[PDB]
PDB file of N, CA and C in Angstrom:
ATOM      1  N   UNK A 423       0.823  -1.202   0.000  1.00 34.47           N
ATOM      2  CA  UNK A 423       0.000   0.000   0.000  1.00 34.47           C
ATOM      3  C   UNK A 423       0.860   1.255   0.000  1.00 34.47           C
ATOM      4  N   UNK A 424       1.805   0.886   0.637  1.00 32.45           N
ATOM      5  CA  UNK A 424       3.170   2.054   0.633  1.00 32.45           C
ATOM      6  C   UNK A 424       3.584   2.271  -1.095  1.00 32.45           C
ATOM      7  N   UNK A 425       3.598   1.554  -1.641  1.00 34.26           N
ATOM      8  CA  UNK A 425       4.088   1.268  -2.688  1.00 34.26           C
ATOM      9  C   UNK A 425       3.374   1.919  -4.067  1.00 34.26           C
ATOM     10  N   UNK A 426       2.314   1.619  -3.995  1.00 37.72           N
ATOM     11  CA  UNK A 426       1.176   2.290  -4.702  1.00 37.72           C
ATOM     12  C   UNK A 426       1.278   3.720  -4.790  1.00 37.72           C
ATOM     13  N   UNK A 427       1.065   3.715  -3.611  1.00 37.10           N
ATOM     14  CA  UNK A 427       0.475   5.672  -2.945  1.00 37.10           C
ATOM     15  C   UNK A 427       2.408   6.538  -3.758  1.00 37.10           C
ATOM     16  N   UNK A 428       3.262   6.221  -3.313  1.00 37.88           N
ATOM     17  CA  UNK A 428       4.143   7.608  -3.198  1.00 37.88           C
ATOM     18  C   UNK A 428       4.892   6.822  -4.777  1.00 37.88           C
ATOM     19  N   UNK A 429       4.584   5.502  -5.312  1.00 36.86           N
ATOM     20  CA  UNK A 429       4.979   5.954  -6.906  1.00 36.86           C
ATOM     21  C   UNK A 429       4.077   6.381  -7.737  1.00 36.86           C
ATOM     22  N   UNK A 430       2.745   6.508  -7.399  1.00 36.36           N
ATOM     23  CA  UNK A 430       1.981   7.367  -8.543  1.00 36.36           C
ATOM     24  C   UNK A 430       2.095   8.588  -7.658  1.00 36.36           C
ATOM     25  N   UNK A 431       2.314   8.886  -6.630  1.00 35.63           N
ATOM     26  CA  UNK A 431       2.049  10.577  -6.203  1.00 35.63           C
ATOM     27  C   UNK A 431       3.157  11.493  -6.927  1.00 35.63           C
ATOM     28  N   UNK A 432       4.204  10.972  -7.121  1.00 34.72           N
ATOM     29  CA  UNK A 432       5.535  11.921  -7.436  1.00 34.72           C
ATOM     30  C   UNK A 432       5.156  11.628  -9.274  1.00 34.72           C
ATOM     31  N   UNK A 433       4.415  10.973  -9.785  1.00 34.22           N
ATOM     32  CA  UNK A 433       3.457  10.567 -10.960  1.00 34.22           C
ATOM     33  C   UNK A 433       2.422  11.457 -11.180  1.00 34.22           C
ATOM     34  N   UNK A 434       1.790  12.163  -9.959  1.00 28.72           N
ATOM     35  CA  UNK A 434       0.820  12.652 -10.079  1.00 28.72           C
ATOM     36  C   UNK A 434      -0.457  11.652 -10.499  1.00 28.72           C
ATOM     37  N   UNK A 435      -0.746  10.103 -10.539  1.00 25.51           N
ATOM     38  CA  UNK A 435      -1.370   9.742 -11.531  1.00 25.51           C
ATOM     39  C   UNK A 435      -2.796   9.199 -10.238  1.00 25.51           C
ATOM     40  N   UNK A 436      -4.346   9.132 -10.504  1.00 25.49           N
ATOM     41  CA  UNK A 436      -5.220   8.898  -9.743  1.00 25.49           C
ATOM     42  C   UNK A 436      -5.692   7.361  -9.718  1.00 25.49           C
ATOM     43  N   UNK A 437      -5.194   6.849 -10.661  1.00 26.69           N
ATOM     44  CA  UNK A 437      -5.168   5.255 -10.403  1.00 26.69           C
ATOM     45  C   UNK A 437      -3.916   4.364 -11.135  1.00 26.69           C
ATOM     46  N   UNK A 438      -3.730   3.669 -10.329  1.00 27.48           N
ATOM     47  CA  UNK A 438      -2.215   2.697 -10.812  1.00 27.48           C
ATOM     48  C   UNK A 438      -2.365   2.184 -12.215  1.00 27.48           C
ATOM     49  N   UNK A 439      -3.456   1.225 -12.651  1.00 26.86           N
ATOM     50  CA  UNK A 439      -3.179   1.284 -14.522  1.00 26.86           C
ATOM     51  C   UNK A 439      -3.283   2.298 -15.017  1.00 26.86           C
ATOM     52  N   UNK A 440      -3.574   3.881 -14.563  1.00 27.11           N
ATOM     53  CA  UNK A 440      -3.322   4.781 -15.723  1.00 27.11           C
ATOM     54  C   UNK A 440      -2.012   5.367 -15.868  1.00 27.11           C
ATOM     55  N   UNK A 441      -0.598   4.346 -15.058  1.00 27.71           N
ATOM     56  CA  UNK A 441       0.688   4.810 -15.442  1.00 27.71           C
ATOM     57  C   UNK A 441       0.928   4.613 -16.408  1.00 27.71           C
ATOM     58  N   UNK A 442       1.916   5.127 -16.883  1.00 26.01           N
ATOM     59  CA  UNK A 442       2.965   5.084 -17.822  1.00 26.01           C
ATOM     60  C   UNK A 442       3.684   3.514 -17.923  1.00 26.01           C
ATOM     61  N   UNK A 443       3.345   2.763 -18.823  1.00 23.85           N
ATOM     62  CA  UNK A 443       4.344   1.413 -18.532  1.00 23.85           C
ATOM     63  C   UNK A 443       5.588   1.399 -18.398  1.00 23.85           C
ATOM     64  N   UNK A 444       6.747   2.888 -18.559  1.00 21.18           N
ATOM     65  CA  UNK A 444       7.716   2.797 -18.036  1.00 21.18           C
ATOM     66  C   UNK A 444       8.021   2.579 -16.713  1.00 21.18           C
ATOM     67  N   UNK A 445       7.267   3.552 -15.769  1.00 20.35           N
ATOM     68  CA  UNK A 445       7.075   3.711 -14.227  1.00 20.35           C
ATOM     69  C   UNK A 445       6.175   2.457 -14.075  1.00 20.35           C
ATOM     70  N   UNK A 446       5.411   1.457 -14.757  1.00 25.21           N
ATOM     71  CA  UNK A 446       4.563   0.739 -13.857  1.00 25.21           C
ATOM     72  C   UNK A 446       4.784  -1.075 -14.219  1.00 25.21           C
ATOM     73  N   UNK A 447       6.370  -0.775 -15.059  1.00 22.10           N
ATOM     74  CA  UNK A 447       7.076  -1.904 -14.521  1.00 22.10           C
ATOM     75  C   UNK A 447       8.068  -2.342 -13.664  1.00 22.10           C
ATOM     76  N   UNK A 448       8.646  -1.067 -12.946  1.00 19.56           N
ATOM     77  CA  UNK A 448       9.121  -0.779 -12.426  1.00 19.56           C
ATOM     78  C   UNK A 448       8.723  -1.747 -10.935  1.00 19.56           C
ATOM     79  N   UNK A 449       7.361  -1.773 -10.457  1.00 14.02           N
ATOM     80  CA  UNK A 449       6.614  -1.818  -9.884  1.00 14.02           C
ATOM     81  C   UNK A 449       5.961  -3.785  -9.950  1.00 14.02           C
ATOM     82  N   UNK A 450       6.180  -4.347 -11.064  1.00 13.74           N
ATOM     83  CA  UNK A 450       6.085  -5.330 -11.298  1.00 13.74           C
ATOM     84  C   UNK A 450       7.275  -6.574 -11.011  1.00 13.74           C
ATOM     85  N   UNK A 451       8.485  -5.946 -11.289  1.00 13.72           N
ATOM     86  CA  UNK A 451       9.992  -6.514 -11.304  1.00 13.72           C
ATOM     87  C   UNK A 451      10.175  -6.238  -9.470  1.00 13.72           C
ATOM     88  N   UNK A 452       9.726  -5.493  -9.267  1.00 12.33           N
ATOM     89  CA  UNK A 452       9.792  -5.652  -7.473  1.00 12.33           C
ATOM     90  C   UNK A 452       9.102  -6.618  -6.584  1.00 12.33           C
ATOM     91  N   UNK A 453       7.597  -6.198  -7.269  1.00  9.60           N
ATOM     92  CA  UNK A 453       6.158  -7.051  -6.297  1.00  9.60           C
ATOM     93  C   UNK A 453       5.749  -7.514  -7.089  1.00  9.60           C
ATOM     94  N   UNK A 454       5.600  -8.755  -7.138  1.00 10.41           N
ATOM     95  CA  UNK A 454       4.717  -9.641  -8.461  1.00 10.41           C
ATOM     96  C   UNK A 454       3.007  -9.786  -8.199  1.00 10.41           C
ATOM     97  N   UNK A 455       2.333  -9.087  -6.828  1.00 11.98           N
ATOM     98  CA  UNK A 455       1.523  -9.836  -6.608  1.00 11.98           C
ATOM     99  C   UNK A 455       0.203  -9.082  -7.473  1.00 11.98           C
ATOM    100  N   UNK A 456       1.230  -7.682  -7.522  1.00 10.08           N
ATOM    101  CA  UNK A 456      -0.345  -7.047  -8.658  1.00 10.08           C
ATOM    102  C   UNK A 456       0.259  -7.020  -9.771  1.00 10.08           C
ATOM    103  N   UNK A 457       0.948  -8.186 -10.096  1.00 10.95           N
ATOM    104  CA  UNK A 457       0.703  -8.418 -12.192  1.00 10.95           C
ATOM    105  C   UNK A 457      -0.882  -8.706 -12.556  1.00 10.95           C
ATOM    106  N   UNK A 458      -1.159  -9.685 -11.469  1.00 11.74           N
ATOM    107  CA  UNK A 458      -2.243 -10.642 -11.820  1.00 11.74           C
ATOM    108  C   UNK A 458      -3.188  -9.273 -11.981  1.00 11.74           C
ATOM    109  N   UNK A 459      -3.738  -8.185 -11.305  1.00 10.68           N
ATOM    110  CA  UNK A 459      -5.143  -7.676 -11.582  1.00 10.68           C
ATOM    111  C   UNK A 459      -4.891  -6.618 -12.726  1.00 10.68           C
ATOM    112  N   UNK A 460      -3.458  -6.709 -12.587  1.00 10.10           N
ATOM    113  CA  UNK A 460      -3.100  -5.259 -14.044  1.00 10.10           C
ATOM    114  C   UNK A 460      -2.655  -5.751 -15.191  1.00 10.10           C
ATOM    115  N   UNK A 461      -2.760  -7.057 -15.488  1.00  8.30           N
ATOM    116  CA  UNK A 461      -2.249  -7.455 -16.635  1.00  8.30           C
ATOM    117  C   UNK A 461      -3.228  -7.807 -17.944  1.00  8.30           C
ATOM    118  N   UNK A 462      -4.110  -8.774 -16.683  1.00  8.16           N
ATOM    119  CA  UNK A 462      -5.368  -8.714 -17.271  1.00  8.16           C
ATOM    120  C   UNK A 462      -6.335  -7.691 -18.140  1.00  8.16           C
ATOM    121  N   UNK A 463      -6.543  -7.611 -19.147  1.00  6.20           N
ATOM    122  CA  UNK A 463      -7.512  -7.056 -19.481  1.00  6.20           C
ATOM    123  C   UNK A 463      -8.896  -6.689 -19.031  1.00  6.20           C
ATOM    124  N   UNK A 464      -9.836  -7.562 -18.936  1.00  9.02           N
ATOM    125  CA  UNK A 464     -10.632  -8.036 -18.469  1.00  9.02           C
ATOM    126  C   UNK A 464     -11.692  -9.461 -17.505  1.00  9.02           C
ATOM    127  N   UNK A 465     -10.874  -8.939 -16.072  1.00  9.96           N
ATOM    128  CA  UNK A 465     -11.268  -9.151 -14.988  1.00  9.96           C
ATOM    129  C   UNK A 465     -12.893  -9.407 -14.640  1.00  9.96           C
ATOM    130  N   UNK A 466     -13.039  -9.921 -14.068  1.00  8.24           N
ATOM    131  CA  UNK A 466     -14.632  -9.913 -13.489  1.00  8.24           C
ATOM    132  C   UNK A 466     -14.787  -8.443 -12.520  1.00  8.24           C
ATOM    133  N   UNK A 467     -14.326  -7.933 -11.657  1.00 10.74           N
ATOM    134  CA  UNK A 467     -14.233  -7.133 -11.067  1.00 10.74           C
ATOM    135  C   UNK A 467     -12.751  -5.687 -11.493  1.00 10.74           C
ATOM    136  N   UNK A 468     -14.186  -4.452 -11.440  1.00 13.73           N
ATOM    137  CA  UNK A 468     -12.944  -3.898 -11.807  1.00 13.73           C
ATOM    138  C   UNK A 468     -11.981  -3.758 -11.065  1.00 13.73           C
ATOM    139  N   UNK A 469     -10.294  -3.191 -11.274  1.00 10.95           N
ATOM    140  CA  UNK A 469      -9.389  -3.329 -10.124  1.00 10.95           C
ATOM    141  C   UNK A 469      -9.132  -2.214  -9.529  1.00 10.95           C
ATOM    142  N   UNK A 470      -8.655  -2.547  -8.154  1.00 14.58           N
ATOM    143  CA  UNK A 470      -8.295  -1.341  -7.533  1.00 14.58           C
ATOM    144  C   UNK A 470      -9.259   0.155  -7.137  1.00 14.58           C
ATOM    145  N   UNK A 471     -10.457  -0.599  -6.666  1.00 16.75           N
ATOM    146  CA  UNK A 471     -11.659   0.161  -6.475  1.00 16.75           C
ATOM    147  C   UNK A 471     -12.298  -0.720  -5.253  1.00 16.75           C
ATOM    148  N   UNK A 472     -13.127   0.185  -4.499  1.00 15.36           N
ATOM    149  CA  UNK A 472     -13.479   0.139  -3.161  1.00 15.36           C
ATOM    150  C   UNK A 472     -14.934  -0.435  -3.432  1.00 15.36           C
ATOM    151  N   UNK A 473     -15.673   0.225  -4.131  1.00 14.41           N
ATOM    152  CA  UNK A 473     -17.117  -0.244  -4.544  1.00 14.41           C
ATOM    153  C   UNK A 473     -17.109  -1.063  -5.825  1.00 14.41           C
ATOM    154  N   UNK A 474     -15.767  -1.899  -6.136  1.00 12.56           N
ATOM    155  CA  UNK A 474     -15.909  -3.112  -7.282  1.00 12.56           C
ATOM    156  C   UNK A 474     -16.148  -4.265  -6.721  1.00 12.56           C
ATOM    157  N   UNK A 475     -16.810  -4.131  -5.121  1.00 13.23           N
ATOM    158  CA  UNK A 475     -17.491  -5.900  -4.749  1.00 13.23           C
ATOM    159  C   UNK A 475     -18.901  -5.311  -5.075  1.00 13.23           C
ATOM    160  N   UNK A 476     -18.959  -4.046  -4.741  1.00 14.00           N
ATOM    161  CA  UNK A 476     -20.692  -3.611  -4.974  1.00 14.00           C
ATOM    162  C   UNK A 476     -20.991  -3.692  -6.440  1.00 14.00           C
ATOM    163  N   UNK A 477     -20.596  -3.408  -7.503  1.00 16.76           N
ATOM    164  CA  UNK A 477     -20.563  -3.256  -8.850  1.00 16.76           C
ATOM    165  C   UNK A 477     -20.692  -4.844  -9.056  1.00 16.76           C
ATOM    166  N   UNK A 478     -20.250  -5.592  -8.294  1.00 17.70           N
ATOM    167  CA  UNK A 478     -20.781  -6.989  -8.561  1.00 17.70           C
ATOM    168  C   UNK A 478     -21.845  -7.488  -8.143  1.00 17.70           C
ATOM    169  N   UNK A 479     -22.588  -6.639  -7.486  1.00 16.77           N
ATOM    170  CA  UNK A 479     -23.508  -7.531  -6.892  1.00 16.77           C
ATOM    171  C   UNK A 479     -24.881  -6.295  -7.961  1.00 16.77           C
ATOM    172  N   UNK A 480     -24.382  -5.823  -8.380  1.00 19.16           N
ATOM    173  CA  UNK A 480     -25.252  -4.368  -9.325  1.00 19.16           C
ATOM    174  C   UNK A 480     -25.322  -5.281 -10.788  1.00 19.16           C
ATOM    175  N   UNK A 481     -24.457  -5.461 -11.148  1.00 19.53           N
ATOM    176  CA  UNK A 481     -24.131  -6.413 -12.928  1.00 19.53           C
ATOM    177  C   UNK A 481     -25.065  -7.313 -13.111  1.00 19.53           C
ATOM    178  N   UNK A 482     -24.759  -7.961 -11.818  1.00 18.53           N
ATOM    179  CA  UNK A 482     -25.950  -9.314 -11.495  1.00 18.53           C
ATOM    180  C   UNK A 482     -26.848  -8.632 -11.773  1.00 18.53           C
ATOM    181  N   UNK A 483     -27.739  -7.670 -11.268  1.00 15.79           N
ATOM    182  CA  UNK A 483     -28.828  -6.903 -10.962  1.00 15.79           C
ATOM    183  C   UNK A 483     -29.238  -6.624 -12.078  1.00 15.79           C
ATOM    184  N   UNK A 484     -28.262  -6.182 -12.936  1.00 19.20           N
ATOM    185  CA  UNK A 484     -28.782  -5.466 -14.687  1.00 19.20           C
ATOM    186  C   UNK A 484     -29.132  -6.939 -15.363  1.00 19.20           C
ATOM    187  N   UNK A 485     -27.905  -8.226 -15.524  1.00 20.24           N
ATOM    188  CA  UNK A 485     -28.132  -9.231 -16.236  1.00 20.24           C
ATOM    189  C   UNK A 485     -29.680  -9.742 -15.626  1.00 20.24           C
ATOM    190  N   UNK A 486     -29.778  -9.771 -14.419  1.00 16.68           N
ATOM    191  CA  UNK A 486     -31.171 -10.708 -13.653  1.00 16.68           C
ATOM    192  C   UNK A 486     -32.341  -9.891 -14.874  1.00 16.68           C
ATOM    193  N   UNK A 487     -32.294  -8.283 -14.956  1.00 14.98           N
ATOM    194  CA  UNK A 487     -33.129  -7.780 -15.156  1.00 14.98           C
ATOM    195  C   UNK A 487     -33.465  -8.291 -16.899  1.00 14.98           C
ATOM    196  N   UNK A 488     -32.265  -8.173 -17.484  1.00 17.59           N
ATOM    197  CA  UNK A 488     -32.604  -7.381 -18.849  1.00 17.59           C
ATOM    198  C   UNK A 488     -32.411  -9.195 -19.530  1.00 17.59           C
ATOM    199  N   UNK A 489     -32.482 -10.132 -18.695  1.00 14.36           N
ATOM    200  CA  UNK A 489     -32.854 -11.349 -19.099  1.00 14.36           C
ATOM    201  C   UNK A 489     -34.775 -11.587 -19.173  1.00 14.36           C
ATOM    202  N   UNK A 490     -34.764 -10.519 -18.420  1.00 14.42           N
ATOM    203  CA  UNK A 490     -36.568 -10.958 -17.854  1.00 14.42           C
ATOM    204  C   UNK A 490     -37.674 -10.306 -19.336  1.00 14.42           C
ATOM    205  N   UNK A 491     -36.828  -9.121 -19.056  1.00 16.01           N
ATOM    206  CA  UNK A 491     -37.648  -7.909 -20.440  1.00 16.01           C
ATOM    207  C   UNK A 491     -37.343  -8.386 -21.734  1.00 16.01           C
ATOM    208  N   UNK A 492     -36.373  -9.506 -22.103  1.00 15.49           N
ATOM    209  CA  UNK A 492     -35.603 -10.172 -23.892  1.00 15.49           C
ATOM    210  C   UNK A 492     -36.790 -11.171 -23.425  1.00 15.49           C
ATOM    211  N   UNK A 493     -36.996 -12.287 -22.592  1.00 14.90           N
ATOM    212  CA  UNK A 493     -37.718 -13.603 -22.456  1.00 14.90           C
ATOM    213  C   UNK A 493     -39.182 -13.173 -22.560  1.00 14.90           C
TER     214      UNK A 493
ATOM    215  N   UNK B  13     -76.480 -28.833   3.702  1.00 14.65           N
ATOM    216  CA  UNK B  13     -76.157 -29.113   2.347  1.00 14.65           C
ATOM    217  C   UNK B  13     -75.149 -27.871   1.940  1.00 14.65           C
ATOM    218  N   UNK B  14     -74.328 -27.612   0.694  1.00 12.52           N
ATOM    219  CA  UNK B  14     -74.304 -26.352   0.493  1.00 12.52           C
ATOM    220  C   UNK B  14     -74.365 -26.298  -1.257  1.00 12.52           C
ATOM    221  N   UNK B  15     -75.055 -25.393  -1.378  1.00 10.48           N
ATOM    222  CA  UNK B  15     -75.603 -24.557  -2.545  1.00 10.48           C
ATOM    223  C   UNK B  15     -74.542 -23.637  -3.781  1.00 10.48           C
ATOM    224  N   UNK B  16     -74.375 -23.864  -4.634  1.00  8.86           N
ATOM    225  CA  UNK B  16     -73.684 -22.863  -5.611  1.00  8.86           C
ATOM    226  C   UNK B  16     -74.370 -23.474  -7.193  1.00  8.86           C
ATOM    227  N   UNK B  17     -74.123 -21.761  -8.048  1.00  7.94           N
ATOM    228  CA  UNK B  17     -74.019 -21.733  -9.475  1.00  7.94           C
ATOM    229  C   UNK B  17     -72.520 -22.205  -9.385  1.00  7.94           C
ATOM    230  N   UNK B  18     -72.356 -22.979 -10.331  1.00  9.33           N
ATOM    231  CA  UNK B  18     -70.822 -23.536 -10.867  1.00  9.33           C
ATOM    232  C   UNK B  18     -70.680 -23.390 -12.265  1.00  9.33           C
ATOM    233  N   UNK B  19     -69.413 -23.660 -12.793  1.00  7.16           N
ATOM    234  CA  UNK B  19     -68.795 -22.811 -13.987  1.00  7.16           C
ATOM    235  C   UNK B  19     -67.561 -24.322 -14.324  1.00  7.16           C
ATOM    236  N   UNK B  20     -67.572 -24.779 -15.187  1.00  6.24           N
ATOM    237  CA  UNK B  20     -66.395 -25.843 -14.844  1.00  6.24           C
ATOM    238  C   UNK B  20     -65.357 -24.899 -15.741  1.00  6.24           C
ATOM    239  N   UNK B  21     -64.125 -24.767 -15.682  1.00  8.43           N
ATOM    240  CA  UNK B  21     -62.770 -24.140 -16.297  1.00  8.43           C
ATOM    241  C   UNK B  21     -62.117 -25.423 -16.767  1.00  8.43           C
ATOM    242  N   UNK B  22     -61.994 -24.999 -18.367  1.00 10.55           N
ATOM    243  CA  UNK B  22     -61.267 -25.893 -18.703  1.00 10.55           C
ATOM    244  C   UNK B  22     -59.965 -24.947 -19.505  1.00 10.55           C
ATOM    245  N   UNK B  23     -58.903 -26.386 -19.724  1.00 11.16           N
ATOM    246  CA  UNK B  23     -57.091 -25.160 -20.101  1.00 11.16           C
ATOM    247  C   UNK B  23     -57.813 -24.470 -21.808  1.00 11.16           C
ATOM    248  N   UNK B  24     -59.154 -24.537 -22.227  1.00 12.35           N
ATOM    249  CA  UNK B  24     -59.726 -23.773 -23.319  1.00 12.35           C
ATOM    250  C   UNK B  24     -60.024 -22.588 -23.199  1.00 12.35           C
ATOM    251  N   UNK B  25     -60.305 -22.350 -21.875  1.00 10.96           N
ATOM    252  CA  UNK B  25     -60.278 -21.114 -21.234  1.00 10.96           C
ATOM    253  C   UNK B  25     -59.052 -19.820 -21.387  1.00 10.96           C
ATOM    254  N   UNK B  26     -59.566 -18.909 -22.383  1.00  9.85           N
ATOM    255  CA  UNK B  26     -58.587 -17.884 -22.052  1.00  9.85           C
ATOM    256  C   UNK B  26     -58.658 -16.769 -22.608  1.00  9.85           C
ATOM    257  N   UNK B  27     -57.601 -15.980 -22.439  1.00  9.76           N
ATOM    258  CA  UNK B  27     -57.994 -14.314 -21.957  1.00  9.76           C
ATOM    259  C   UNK B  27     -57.248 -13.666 -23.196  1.00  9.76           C
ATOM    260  N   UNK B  28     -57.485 -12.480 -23.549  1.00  7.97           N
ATOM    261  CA  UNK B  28     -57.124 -11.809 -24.940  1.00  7.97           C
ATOM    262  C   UNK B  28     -56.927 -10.379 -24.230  1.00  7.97           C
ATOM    263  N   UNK B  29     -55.578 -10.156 -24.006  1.00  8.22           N
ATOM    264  CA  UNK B  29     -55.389  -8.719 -23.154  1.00  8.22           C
ATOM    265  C   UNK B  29     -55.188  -7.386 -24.807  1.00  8.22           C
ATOM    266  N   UNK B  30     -55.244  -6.512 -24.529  1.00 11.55           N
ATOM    267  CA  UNK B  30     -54.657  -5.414 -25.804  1.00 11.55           C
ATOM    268  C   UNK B  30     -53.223  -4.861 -25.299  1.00 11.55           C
ATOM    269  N   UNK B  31     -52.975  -4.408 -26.124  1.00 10.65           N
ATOM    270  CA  UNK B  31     -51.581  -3.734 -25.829  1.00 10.65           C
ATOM    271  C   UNK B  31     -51.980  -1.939 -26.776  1.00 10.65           C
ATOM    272  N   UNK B  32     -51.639  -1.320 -25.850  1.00  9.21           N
ATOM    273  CA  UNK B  32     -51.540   0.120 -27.040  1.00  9.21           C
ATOM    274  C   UNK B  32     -49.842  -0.150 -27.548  1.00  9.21           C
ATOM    275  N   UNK B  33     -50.039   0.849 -28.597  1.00  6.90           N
ATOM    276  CA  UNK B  33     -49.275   0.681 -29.286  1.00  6.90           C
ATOM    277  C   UNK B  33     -47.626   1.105 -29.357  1.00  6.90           C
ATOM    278  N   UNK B  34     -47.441   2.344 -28.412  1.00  7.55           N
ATOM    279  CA  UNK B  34     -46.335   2.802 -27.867  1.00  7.55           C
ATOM    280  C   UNK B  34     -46.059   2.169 -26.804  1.00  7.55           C
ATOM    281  N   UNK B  35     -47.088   1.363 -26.402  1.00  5.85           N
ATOM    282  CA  UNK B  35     -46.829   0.406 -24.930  1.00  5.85           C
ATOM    283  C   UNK B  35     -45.375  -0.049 -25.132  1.00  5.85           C
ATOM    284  N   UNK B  36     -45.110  -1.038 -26.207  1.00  5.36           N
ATOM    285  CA  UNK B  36     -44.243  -1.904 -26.041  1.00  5.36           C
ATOM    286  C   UNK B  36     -43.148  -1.501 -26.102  1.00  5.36           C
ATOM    287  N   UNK B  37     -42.784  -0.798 -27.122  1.00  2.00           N
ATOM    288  CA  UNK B  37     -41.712  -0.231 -26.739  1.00  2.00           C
ATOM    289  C   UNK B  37     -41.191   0.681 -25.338  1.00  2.00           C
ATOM    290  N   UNK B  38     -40.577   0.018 -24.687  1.00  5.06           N
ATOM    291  CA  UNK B  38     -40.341   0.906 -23.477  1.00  5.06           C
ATOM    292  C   UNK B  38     -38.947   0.722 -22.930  1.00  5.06           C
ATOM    293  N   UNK B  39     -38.637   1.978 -22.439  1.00  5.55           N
ATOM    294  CA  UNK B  39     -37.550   2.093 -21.843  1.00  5.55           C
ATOM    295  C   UNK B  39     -36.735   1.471 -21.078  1.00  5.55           C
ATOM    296  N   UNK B  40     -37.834   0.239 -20.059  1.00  5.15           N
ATOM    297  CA  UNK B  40     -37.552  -0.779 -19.167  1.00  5.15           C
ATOM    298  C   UNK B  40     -37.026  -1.656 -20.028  1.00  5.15           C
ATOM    299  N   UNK B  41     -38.026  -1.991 -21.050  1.00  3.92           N
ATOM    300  CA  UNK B  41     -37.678  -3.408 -21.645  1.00  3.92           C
ATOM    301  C   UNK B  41     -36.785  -3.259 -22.511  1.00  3.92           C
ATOM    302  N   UNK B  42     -35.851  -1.932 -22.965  1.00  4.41           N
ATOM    303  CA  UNK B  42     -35.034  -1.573 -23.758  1.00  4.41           C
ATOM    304  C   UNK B  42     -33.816  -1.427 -23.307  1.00  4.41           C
ATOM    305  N   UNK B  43     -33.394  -2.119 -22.055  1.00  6.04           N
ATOM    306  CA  UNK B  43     -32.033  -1.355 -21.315  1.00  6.04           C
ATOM    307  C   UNK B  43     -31.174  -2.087 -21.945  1.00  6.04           C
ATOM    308  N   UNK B  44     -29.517  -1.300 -21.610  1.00  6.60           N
ATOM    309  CA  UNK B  44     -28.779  -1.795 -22.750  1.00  6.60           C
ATOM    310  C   UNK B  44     -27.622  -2.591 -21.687  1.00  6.60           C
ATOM    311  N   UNK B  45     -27.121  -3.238 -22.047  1.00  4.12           N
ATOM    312  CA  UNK B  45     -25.935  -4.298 -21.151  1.00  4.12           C
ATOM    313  C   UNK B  45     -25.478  -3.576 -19.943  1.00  4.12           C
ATOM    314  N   UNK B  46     -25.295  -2.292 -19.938  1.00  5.67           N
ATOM    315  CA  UNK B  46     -24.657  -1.465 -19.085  1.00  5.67           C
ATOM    316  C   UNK B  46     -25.177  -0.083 -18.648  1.00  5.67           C
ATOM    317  N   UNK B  47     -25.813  -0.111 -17.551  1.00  5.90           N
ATOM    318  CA  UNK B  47     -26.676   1.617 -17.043  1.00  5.90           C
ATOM    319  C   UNK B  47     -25.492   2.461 -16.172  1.00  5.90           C
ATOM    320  N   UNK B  48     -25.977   3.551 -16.344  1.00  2.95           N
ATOM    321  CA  UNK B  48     -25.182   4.320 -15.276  1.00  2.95           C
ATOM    322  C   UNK B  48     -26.386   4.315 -13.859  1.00  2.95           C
ATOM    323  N   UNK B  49     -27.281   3.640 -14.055  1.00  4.34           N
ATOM    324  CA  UNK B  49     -28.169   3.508 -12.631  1.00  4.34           C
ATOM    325  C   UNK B  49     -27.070   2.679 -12.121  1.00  4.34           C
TER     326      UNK B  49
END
């Protein structure tokens, strides 16, 4: 969490995949453990967000729906 | 004893609702993969 915060701050940048892939391999070759959510494209959950367990339980909510209104 | 008019229902039985015509199309039943709700 140390890690995150003061290399995008001197970055200026408001979320970690919107670095620069120079600075945000930097970051990979150190800590391997967030390759896995930044490498990915597309995740089930978006990454590195506070309300991406709620956004899961919302998706459900749209698919439950807009299965009911096609059937 | 007890007393009734009776009606027997058979699955021949059935109902013919209308729809107006801008009905169907609707906004609910039109949502798209992804809302900002």
């Amino acid at each position: 969490a140390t890690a995150l915060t003061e290399a995008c701050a001197a970055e200026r940048v408001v979320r970690p995949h919107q670095l620069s892939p120079a600075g945000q391999a930097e970051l990979l070759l150190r800590f391997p453990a967030l390759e896995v959510p930044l490498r990915h494209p597309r995740p089930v959950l978006p990454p590195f967000d506070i309300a991406a367990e709620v956004a899961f339980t919302a998706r459900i909510h749209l698919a439950c729906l807009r299965a009911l209104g096609q059937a | 004893w007890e007393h009734r008019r009776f009606i027997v229902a058979d699955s021949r039985n059935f109902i013919t609702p209308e729809f107006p015509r801008d009905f169907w199309m609707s906004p609910v039943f039109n949502l798209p993969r992804e809302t900002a709700a």
